[PDB]
Amino acid sequence: EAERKAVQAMWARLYANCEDVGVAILVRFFVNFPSAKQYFSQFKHMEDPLEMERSPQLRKHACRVMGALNTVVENLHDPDKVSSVLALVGKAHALKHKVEPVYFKILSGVILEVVAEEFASDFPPETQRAWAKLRGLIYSHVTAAYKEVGW
Amino acid sequence: EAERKAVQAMWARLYANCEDVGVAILVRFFVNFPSAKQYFSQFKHMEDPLEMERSPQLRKHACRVMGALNTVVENLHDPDKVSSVLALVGKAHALKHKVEPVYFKILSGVILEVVAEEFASDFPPETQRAWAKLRGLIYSHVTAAYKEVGW
Numbered sequence: 001e002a003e004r005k006a007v008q009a010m011w012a013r014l015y016a017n018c019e020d021v022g023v024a025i026l027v028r029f030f031v032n033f034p035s036a037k038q039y040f041s042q043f044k045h046m047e048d049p050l051e052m053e054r055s056p057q058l059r060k061h062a063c064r065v066m067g068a069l070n071t072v073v074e075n076l077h078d079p080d081k082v083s084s085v086l087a088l089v090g091k092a093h094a095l096k097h098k099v100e101p102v103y104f105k106i107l108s109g110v111i112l113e114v115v116a117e118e119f120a121s122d123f124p125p126e127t128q129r130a131w132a133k134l135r136g137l138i139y140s141h142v143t144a145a146y147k148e149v150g151w
Numbered sequence: 152e153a154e155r156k157a158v159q160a161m162w163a164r165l166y167a168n169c170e171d172v173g174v175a176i177l178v179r180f181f182v183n184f185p186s187a188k189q190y191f192s193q194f195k196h197m198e199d200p201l202e203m204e205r206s207p208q209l210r211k212h213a214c215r216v217m218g219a220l221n222t223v224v225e226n227l228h229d230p231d232k233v234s235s236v237l238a239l240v241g242k243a244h245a246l247k248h249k250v251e252p253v254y255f256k257i258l259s260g261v262i263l264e265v266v267a268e269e270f271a272s273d274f275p276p277e278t279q280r281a282w283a284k285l286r287g288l289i290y291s292h293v294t295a296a297y298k299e300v301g302w
């Protein structure tokens with residue numbers, strides 16, 4: 001549990017650096033995993049990262065992703081707050097966007113780098129772990145959500 | 152004091168809508184007050200709002216503005232937390248950027264609209280006031296900062 005402070009404190013800085021990381025993340029996700037771009041009308045067909053870094057849609061989504069991940073992160077202390085936040089996301093993505101679930105695990109993977117990258121000798125020993133686990137909370141809560149919904 | 156909750160709650164929604172308002176604000180400020188654009192190397196010479204809405208620099212600054220205003224807003228309850236946050240900003244802007252102080256009062260003015268605009272029958276009676284006062288805290292703390300620094 002307490003490994004969370006290590007996460008909550010790392011995430012807080014990350015989420016306020018104003019060097020939009022959510023977009024760096026979304027862009028790295030789509031270059032490395034081009035198939036995930038069909039779900040987005042505006043940039044389905046973009047191949048240049050810079051052209052992606054500019055897409056309004058990609059930017060609104062990064063924001064939405066970072067926005068919900070912070071609520072989660074900021075409330076790792078309330079298991080039900082996590083459950084609901086992630087459950088709603090899962091539901092919406094399964095029923096509305098029909099996004100293949102595995103993409104949540106992969107995107108989280110990308111988030112784990114860009115953090116590991118940016119923390120310093122800082123990005124962690126055993127905490128590289130806290131972020132492994134959190135990458136667990138995000139994928140299991142979302143997968144269960146896909147279940148209830150019946151995927 | 153308590154008028155703050157009205158502000159803190161309105162600001163919270165505003166700061167998380169993902170329809171980047173900080174940029175809408177910065178862009179409205181510069182169209183209506185073109186002289187304030189000399190302080191920025193990247194867009195000193197831009198005349199089209201859309202071309203402004205895209206400027207990386209304008210975007211990093213909006214973020215920085217919104218970032219500090221939230222800390223302030225989020226701590227109206229701690230007068231010294233406000234003092235320090237606004238004091239640092241004032242100092243930096245006076246000594247580093249040499250920005251005419253009055254621009255802080257004017258930009259706040261712009262922020263007051265875009266909020267009044269966006270809240271509904273919501274944007275307030277007496278609270279239109281809470282935001283008038285807060286627009287006071289921001290300008291007096293910054294002006295004093297310019298003083299200490301000796302402008």
Ligand code: HEM
Nearest residue numbers: 036039040057064065068069089092096097099103104107
């Ligand atoms: C870290 C996990 C993620 C979070 C927290 C997240 C959060 C959000 C939120 C709050 C919205 C607005 C949803 C709506 O009303 O439809 C959204 C939209 C969307 N998400 Fe995600 N999302 C995540 C991962 C993904 C992944 C992996 C994909 C796969 C490519 C994806 C594809 C979409 C699409 C297509 C939309 C609708 C786009 C639009 O309306 O412009 N999301 N997401």
Ligand code: HEM
Nearest residue numbers: 187190191208215216219220240243247248250254255258
């Ligand atoms: C709501 C009030 C404002 C806040 C909270 C705010 C906050 C910030 C922060 C955190 C930075 C980074 C500062 C640095 O290291 O230099 C910054 C930079 C800057 N601000 Fe502001 N600012 C505000 C108003 C203004 C106004 C009214 C102007 C006048 C045009 C202005 C012009 C600048 C400039 C030129 C920079 C440096 C730009 C760069 O490095 O790209 N700011 N501000």
